[model samples]
Target: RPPGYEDPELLASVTPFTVEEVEALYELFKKLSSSIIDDGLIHKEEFQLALFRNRNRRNLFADRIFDVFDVKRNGVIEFGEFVRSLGVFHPSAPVHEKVKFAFKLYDLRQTGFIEREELKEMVVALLHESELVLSEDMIEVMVDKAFVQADRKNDGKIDIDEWKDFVSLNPSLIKNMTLPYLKDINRT
Candidate 1:
């Protein structure tokens, strides 16, 4: 059922990806099974309908999310880490503390600027240091989302110049926009 057949929990969720997780949903829906209504598209009411109408969309969504958190180049994520990453570990995990911790982690400049590559490299290094063994495909997929935030031109790729500008703008925007975009995309 999976590459290594070890992702049983991921296979369980049917409506895991949220409406806020979908982008270009209308555009994507327009290409497939049916045309998403303009009002529904703009208002985002069509998001649920789109996924429900699609084949195995939830599996795709959950699997992609799983891959994003598998930082060690390993095909699977440790149960504890996965739960923590998803905020499903325990309610005791403070949300604000998590946010602040991340703020310091990625805000390399302390001026509140964090370049795309810097973020990517940090995560990648973390994987190695933590012995996560994530796959290259997973990491690339994760980093590609940063390129989207860092490249304002909507270009397919991100370069140093674009990343620099993206970082200088604001640390919160960079991390929030880029990281969540990937997590959302990972949900498919």
Candidate 2:
């Protein structure tokens, strides 16, 4: 990691991330898990993924997620399976629409995408409304960074496809990373 000698093989830096190579990362994103639509937020594994490991009934989705995590499709997502699935997530229409349920709450301008400033307002409102007692300035800064990473285009706009692309590549981005298909359960 010295100047003028870039290691494309190695990540340049790390944040609050789950590092396990590219494929392992993809599996983490694709894995199925329980999700809930609370008020409007699409929370996946609302309880399970929220913790490292939660002891509870099988969510059905959880098992599928495990299979996904087993990238090799060998009933076990060993390290090999993990590496095979990285950089595979794409922006999908369906996935976008679902994420919109939450995005819309923040995109008050009906811009069809969320800009960094807009996103900041959204997160701030959530924390404030929820009475989370968090530092608004600090949260705003973090939220700005998070949104910057998600922007991908740096166009100050966020659509659904942009979102899936974000999740598939960085599963840990969300507290819950279940497919939009399962979170809704009733809808594909």
Candidate 3:
């Protein structure tokens, strides 16, 4: 049986997923649960495994996203938190939330801004995930261009407000944040 669903309104407040869709996600979460533990929670390793099998190929981008989903900072994801955090990825989610989460992924130091090095590291990981890579010099050039546009004050860092404006100019960056499946489900 699917877990009890959160009130549809509560879920709707943060995500476009209906109660039924959220319960469907609960079923998927159950399968993704730790193999050694039946607890209704997703452990970090379990989350990582669900994303990739080659341990060495695990993506830092995924890890950072998992960190954001963990919400409680408890190293594990409970179903409710999982559903709500994921709600932000639905096509109808507020752009501001996606931009905020995107910023968090690049802010490796958990500082209030994205440092140049942090953006570089994220770009490298993103390239690896796409299985396409550019020369180191090219990557550096790309990062420079991004900062030139994103760092509005020439402050050498991109803060939350700056990120919002940057995303407005380059909305494609957050396009992947939306899960096509979520929109498909909502369509029915």
How does candidate 1 fare on TM-score? 0.27
What TM-score should be assigned to candidate 2? 0.35
| Model 3, residue 21: C-alpha shift (Å) | 0.9
C-alpha lDDT (0 to 100) for residue 146 of candidate 3: 85
Candidate 1 lDDT, tens digit per residue, 67-92?
A: 44343535544432333344321233
Q: Any runs in candidate 1 off by more than 4 Å, and if so which?
A: 1-93, 129-141, 147-188
In Å, residue 24's CA in model 3 sits off its true spot by: 1.2
Q: Scored by Cα lDDT, where does model 3 land?
A: 0.77
User: How much lDDT does each candidate structure score?
Assistant: 0.43, 0.44, 0.77
Q: Following a full C-alpha superposition, what root-mean-square deviation does model 3 have from the true structure?
A: 3.8
Q: What TM-score, over all chains together, does every model reach?
A: 0.27, 0.35, 0.83
lDDT-sorted candidate list, best first: 3, 2, 1
Per-residue error for 92 in candidate 3, Å, reads 1.1
Instruction: Show where candidate 2 strays beyond 4 Å.
Output: 1-97, 167-188
- RMSD (Cα, Å) of candidate 1? 17.5
Ranking by TM-score: 3, 2, 1
For 1-188, candidate 2 gives per-residue lDDT tens digits of 43323232442122112243332333333342223432211133343453335332234334433444344334433333323222212123244333434444445555667677766765665455457767767887778777887888777777777876765775443322223322122211
lDDT of 1 at 67: 41
CA lDDT, candidate 2, residue 168: 70
- Which residue pairs overlap in candidate 3's backbone? none
